[PDB]
Scaffold this active site. Structure first.
Site, mmCIF file in Angstrom:
data_model
loop_
_atom_site.group_PDB
_atom_site.id
_atom_site.type_symbol
_atom_site.label_atom_id
_atom_site.label_comp_id
_atom_site.label_asym_id
_atom_site.label_seq_id
_atom_site.Cartn_x
_atom_site.Cartn_y
_atom_site.Cartn_z
ATOM 1 N N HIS A 25 0.821 -1.212 0.000
ATOM 2 C CA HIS A 25 0.000 0.000 0.000
ATOM 3 C C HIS A 25 0.845 1.249 0.000
ATOM 4 O O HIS A 25 2.017 1.215 0.389
ATOM 5 C CB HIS A 25 -0.948 0.003 1.197
ATOM 6 C CG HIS A 25 -0.242 0.006 2.534
ATOM 7 N ND1 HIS A 25 0.117 1.145 3.162
ATOM 8 C CD2 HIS A 25 0.180 -1.046 3.351
ATOM 9 C CE1 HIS A 25 0.731 0.841 4.323
ATOM 10 N NE2 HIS A 25 0.770 -0.502 4.435
ATOM 11 N N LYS A 85 -6.454 -3.371 -7.419
ATOM 12 C CA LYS A 85 -6.481 -2.173 -6.592
ATOM 13 C C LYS A 85 -7.870 -2.057 -5.993
ATOM 14 O O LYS A 85 -8.874 -2.241 -6.694
ATOM 15 C CB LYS A 85 -6.110 -0.920 -7.399
ATOM 16 C CG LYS A 85 -4.628 -0.863 -7.737
ATOM 17 C CD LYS A 85 -4.215 0.441 -8.400
ATOM 18 C CE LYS A 85 -4.337 1.626 -7.468
ATOM 19 N NZ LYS A 85 -3.823 2.845 -8.154
ATOM 20 N N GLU A 87 -3.073 -5.213 -15.103
ATOM 21 C CA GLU A 87 -2.030 -6.133 -15.553
ATOM 22 C C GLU A 87 -1.034 -6.351 -14.414
ATOM 23 O O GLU A 87 -0.540 -5.383 -13.842
ATOM 24 C CB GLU A 87 -1.342 -5.540 -16.789
ATOM 25 C CG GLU A 87 0.025 -6.113 -17.106
ATOM 26 C CD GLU A 87 0.709 -5.445 -18.291
ATOM 27 O OE1 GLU A 87 0.278 -4.357 -18.754
ATOM 28 O OE2 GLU A 87 1.693 -6.029 -18.766
ATOM 29 N N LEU A 88 -0.762 -7.618 -14.079
ATOM 30 C CA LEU A 88 0.144 -7.955 -12.979
ATOM 31 C C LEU A 88 1.598 -7.683 -13.358
ATOM 32 O O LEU A 88 2.089 -8.155 -14.388
ATOM 33 C CB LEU A 88 -0.024 -9.413 -12.523
ATOM 34 C CG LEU A 88 0.856 -9.899 -11.348
ATOM 35 C CD1 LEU A 88 0.548 -9.138 -10.065
ATOM 36 C CD2 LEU A 88 0.710 -11.399 -11.120
ATOM 37 N N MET A 89 2.282 -6.921 -12.512
ATOM 38 C CA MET A 89 3.671 -6.575 -12.765
ATOM 39 C C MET A 89 4.520 -7.125 -11.620
ATOM 40 O O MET A 89 4.690 -6.485 -10.576
ATOM 41 C CB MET A 89 3.820 -5.063 -12.945
ATOM 42 C CG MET A 89 2.939 -4.483 -14.054
ATOM 43 S SD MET A 89 3.585 -4.789 -15.709
ATOM 44 C CE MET A 89 4.950 -3.628 -15.724
ATOM 45 N N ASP A 126 3.750 13.455 -13.386
ATOM 46 C CA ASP A 126 4.486 12.830 -12.288
ATOM 47 C C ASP A 126 5.354 11.668 -12.776
ATOM 48 O O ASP A 126 5.303 10.564 -12.228
ATOM 49 C CB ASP A 126 3.507 12.378 -11.198
ATOM 50 C CG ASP A 126 4.169 12.194 -9.841
ATOM 51 O OD1 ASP A 126 5.385 12.457 -9.695
ATOM 52 O OD2 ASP A 126 3.453 11.765 -8.911
ATOM 53 N N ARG A 138 9.160 5.905 -8.832
ATOM 54 C CA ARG A 138 8.079 5.440 -7.951
ATOM 55 C C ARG A 138 6.778 5.133 -8.700
ATOM 56 O O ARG A 138 5.941 4.393 -8.185
ATOM 57 C CB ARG A 138 7.798 6.470 -6.842
ATOM 58 C CG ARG A 138 7.274 7.793 -7.389
ATOM 59 C CD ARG A 138 6.756 8.777 -6.345
ATOM 60 N NE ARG A 138 6.558 10.077 -6.990
ATOM 61 C CZ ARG A 138 7.526 10.980 -7.158
ATOM 62 N NH1 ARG A 138 8.747 10.738 -6.691
ATOM 63 N NH2 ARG A 138 7.281 12.130 -7.773
ATOM 64 N N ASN A 139 6.607 5.706 -9.897
ATOM 65 C CA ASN A 139 5.371 5.540 -10.688
ATOM 66 C C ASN A 139 5.536 4.608 -11.888
ATOM 67 O O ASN A 139 4.736 4.637 -12.820
ATOM 68 C CB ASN A 139 4.830 6.898 -11.162
ATOM 69 C CG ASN A 139 4.303 7.751 -10.024
ATOM 70 O OD1 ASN A 139 3.625 7.258 -9.131
ATOM 71 N ND2 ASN A 139 4.604 9.039 -10.061
ATOM 72 N N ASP A 187 1.138 4.338 -12.657
ATOM 73 C CA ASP A 187 0.322 5.220 -11.825
ATOM 74 C C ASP A 187 -0.030 6.515 -12.567
ATOM 75 O O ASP A 187 0.809 7.080 -13.277
ATOM 76 C CB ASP A 187 1.016 5.500 -10.486
ATOM 77 C CG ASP A 187 0.157 6.329 -9.548
ATOM 78 O OD1 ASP A 187 0.230 7.569 -9.611
ATOM 79 O OD2 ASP A 187 -0.613 5.739 -8.766
HETATM 80 C C1 LIG Z 1 10.888 -8.596 -4.390
HETATM 81 N N1 LIG Z 1 9.855 -7.685 -4.719
HETATM 82 C C2 LIG Z 1 8.802 -7.649 -3.762
HETATM 83 C C3 LIG Z 1 7.685 -6.795 -4.271
HETATM 84 N N2 LIG Z 1 7.188 -7.277 -5.526
HETATM 85 C C4 LIG Z 1 6.153 -6.623 -5.968
HETATM 86 C C5 LIG Z 1 5.485 -7.115 -7.053
HETATM 87 C C6 LIG Z 1 4.385 -6.483 -7.509
HETATM 88 C C7 LIG Z 1 3.861 -5.347 -6.971
HETATM 89 C C8 LIG Z 1 2.701 -4.758 -7.526
HETATM 90 O O1 LIG Z 1 1.886 -4.229 -6.824
HETATM 91 N N3 LIG Z 1 2.540 -4.934 -8.834
HETATM 92 C C9 LIG Z 1 1.587 -4.371 -9.580
HETATM 93 N N4 LIG Z 1 1.204 -5.006 -10.622
HETATM 94 N N5 LIG Z 1 0.311 -4.294 -11.237
HETATM 95 C C10 LIG Z 1 0.138 -3.179 -10.638
HETATM 96 C C11 LIG Z 1 -0.664 -2.157 -10.898
HETATM 97 C C12 LIG Z 1 -0.672 -1.044 -10.097
HETATM 98 C C13 LIG Z 1 0.158 -1.039 -9.000
HETATM 99 C C14 LIG Z 1 0.211 0.065 -8.172
HETATM 100 C C15 LIG Z 1 1.461 0.701 -8.266
HETATM 101 C C16 LIG Z 1 1.837 1.430 -9.396
HETATM 102 C C17 LIG Z 1 3.036 2.082 -9.540
HETATM 103 F F1 LIG Z 1 3.251 2.616 -10.394
HETATM 104 C C18 LIG Z 1 3.924 1.970 -8.488
HETATM 105 C C19 LIG Z 1 3.607 1.250 -7.343
HETATM 106 F F2 LIG Z 1 4.288 1.164 -6.543
HETATM 107 C C20 LIG Z 1 2.376 0.619 -7.234
HETATM 108 C C21 LIG Z 1 0.946 -2.146 -8.785
HETATM 109 C C22 LIG Z 1 0.939 -3.190 -9.588
HETATM 110 C C23 LIG Z 1 4.555 -4.886 -5.850
HETATM 111 N N6 LIG Z 1 4.107 -3.820 -5.254
HETATM 112 C C24 LIG Z 1 4.813 -3.137 -4.229
HETATM 113 C C25 LIG Z 1 5.092 -1.815 -4.719
HETATM 114 C C26 LIG Z 1 5.752 -1.059 -3.647
HETATM 115 O O2 LIG Z 1 4.847 -0.730 -2.753
HETATM 116 C C27 LIG Z 1 4.506 -1.932 -2.148
HETATM 117 C C28 LIG Z 1 3.908 -2.939 -3.125
HETATM 118 C C29 LIG Z 1 5.667 -5.519 -5.354
HETATM 119 C C30 LIG Z 1 8.303 -7.245 -6.401
HETATM 120 C C31 LIG Z 1 9.250 -8.235 -5.873
#
Ligand SMILES: CN1CCN(c2ccc(C(=O)Nc3n[nH]c4ccc(Cc5cc(F)cc(F)c5)cc34)c(NC3CCOCC3)c2)CC1
Length: 298
Positions: free
Chosen positions: A32, A54, A101-103, A153, A157-158, A174
């Site tokens: 979060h 989300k 889409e899962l990233m 932006d 971070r985005n 983002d």
């Molecule tokens: C070893 N690492 C541990 C963390 N791990 C991940 C993997 C995936 C996410 C994640 O939220 N992925 C998102 N996929 N799609 C999104 C869309 C939307 C979003 C929202 C978003 C968009 C953006 F541009 C930046 C962000 F941080 C989050 C995310 C995904 C993820 N999210 C973390 C991001 C940092 O804050 C804590 C959670 C972490 C990668 C492996």
């Protein structure tokens, strides 16, 4: 019910792809922040599709509600490989969901910090990996520019990555800042903003060019905070005085030059994203650039 316009086209809640709630399973929490709240999920048609989810807090304001709707509309209308896809929404059940889409690689900033070359793993990243990420995001930014959408932006971070290892693709993930304006403060991304942005307050695609230059510094520094040791006001004054960041450690001159042209005081002196892309591609093909070793963090 609000309408949203992109590329001359108008859409509303009706146009969003509502996925039946029963088709959606939350797998695990991811994290979060300022972006909201994200989970890994699955979408079945009855091999399910792996997604990010989300969520909107059930206890929330009505502007919150309208924010969530707008975010959904904005992302669903983008159609580019370097912008995260929207699979659909689930706004007819509570809590409300947006399916993205899962990233699996997470956010770019954390990736760069975590993947810094070290005595134990002294070749975790190479210059070409940085140049590919840069190209990936410039391509998404070029799409936005040609479609007259100003991001506002552009920062590490985005940005998100498809996976940690070889073959990772970076994408803009983002659009909160753009959502907010479609609807100075201490939350403003001052360190990513051109001098004219604090001043007459006018944003263009050249303001994104400026931010992309700062993103470039973030990438090649391997995830450092821009203008180390300066506050928001200090950066603002420094930047408007003509002051600019030094190259990140071991940054090839050709790469730094892209940054410095992105930070030209005059907006019309700054390259558009087509020129930025050409310059990145040239850097990518120059052996002296790509054979430059990144620094080992001790
Ligand atoms: C070893 N690492 C541990 C963390 N791990 C991940 C993997 C995936 C996410 C994640 O939220 N992925 C998102 N996929 N799609 C999104 C869309 C939307 C979003 C929202 C978003 C968009 C953006 F541009 C930046 C962000 F941080 C989050 C995310 C995904 C993820 N999210 C973390 C991001 C940092 O804050 C804590 C959670 C972490 C990668 C492996």
């Amino acid at each position: 019910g609000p309408n949203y316009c992109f590329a001359g086209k108008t859409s509303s809640i009706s146009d969003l792809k509502e996925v039946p709630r029963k088709n959606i399973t939350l797998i695990r929490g991811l994290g979060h922040g300022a972006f909201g709240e994200v989970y890994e999920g699955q979408v079945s048609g009855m091999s399910p599709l792996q997604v990010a989810v989300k969520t909107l807090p059930e206890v929330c304001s009505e502007q919150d509600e309208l924010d969530f709707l707008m975010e959904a509309l904005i992302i669903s209308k983008f159609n580019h490989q370097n912008i995260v896809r929207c699979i659909g929404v689930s706004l007819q059940s509570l809590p409300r969901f947006i399916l993205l889409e899962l990233m699996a690689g997470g956010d770019l900033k954390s990736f760069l910090r975590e993947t810094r070359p070290r005595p134990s793993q002294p070749s975790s990243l190479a210059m070409l990996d940085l140049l590919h990420v840069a190209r990936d995001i410039a391509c998404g930014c070029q799409y936005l520019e040609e479609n007259h959408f100003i991001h506002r932006d552009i920062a590490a971070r985005n940005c998100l990555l498809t996976c940690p290892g070889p073959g990772r693709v970076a994408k803009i993930g983002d659009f909160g800042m753009a959502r907010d304006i479609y609807r100075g403060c201490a939350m403003l991304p001052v360190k990513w903003m051109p001098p004219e942005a604090f001043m007459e307050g006018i944003f263009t695609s050249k303001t994104d060019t400026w931010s992309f230059g700062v993103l470039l510094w973030e990438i090649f520094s391997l995830g450092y905070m821009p203008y180390p040791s300066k506050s928001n006001q200090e950066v603002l004054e420094f930047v408007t005085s003509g002051g600019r960041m030094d190259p990140p450690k071991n940054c090839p001159g050709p790469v730094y030059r892209i940054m410095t042209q992105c930070w030209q005081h005059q907006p019309e002196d700054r390259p558009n994203f087509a020129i930025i892309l050409e310059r990145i591609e040239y850097c990518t093909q120059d052996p002296d650039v790509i054979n430059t070793a990144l620094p080992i963090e001790y």
